[PDB]
Amino acid sequence: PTHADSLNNLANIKREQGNIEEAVRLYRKALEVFPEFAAAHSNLASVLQQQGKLQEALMHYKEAIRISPTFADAYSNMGNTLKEMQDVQGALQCYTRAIQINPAFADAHSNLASIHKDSGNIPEAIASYRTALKLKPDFPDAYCNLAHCLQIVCDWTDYDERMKKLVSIVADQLEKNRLPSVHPHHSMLYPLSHGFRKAIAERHGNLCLDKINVLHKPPYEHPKDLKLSDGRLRVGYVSSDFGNHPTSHLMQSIPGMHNPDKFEVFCYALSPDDGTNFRVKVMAEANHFIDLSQIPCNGKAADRIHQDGIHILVNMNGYTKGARNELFALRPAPIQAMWLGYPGTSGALFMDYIITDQETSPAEVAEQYSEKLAYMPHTFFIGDHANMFPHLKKKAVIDFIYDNRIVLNGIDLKAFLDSLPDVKIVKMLNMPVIPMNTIAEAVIEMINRGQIQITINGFSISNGLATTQINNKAATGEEVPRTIIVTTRSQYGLPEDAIVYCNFNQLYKIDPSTLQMWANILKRVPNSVLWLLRFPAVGEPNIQQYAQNMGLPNRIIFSPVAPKEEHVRRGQLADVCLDTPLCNGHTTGMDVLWAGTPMVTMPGETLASRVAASQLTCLGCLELIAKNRQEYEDIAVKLGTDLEYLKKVRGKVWKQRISSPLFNTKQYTMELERLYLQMWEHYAAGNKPDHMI
């Protein structure tokens, strides 16, 4: 019993150090000496949970509770295990039981708060975190998770004080070599130093290294040349997001456009098949597709990669949901590169390169990254919009001349227009204009009444609000629409006679400084409106109130989050997109540019704050990039007042989304291929990774 206590206490310290194998051995020894040791069972369970041995963990949590029925911490931690098994009901039953046993138990309230947040109940998550902090005022995990909840709903009460405290918490945790409470993916939202952001990432990367060290794997032996692969470079794309996810919406065409004479493409899915066409396409077009979600053990999964003989292993998750960076910690390939899916450094020694570009990641700030910079020649960003939304390549309008009040798009648009009596062609290449006649009145009536669809001259004419009722795969971007679609300002309650500024990002990317810039722009441009999304809806009244305090009178119009195709299509109704400087639109940036909408941006220092500028630079619209806040406001106001200049800039975006490299997936793949061969030839000549420009 006292012998068991010493073993348990030692195990606890071994665990804090990341010596997982030794911790497990010691807990098991403690239980051998004292079988009825509830704390030892619970501690062993927690380390088993950390290793992914969820059923074995459960068994030990239950044993702890059988021994001590009021062991609130066992229930709390059992709840986390059930949550990891996707058993939300079981998780809530355990958290609520823990809180019933001990209502003053801060950790349980914090765990309950997290599952509320994950479920989409932000107000209850906020409340539970505030309870946790009331009970234990020094609780870094709860404070930082609360800070993100408040960010999500644009609650900026004591914002500057909150930001200072977050930085203080991180400093203190890094100085004591604890895992920081700010998640790496969230670190770009807070005014932390580049050193601190890199250090956060590094500590999270180290969790993966600790988990793989239990396996006792030697270094893998890596190919020195391309002899076994018939002169083909074997590239492995590892992602949890081959499916309906923004990353597939960016790169689903890339695997299939690789040159099979020089490349062999392996796609390693970390997620099961979600039934979507995105997954179908990558599975069909990759040379090889391997479902690693079927191989939960990271040792056997990493062996699976090494057999395939991969030269370049590409990490598309970083520290996003579904990552299995334990696979990369094992180094099953000689070159390992970060690409596209994660807008930051891994901070980890097991990743060699980050694929970026000179606009996103200039040489100056190379200390921000642990990896070496590998530059793509234009932008590292890419979008599959040309393939997914080819019906948006051309448009027509109805003259109720405006390009963005009443818009038609469709694969068969040309044939429909050719069936109409008096269509006017406005040169920009050109925009057809349907004059106000009986046919135009039929279309406007469909929209006003909220009808799903009509037929004109045998052509199917669809209401853009009803896409999920007509073809749900066309709504998600899984299929191209087979009808002509109508999109109007009146559908979204937008003004017919004023400038529409838009931003379609999640509201967490907005901060007080940003909303102040936007208010300043709106005050300078009479009648204009700012179009935002209910992303989530509970953020709306906070935004509206802070805007009221800055002096804005119904100048901000919210719309619901839409299905993918509608979201992209409705961007055609805006005049100008106002990008979020804190963290730019990434996928959302590509979406707005595909509609022909100019985006004003102010590049910061973080990778996440510079993506929009890189997109615009590739597009060829340097005039939309601001060097400071005054320039951002001046650019936006000029676009909203100088209507000939707006027309020119919109025409430039409309043309250059086709003529520039930005959406050209073939050109991108070929450039990516050149970069892979540089990486390979550099390594084949015995060299360590170095920067590449």
Partner: peptide, 7 residues
């Protein structure tokens, strides 16, 4: 319903 990039 709307997938996003998340931590």
């Amino acid at each position: 319903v709307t997938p996003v990039s998340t931590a």
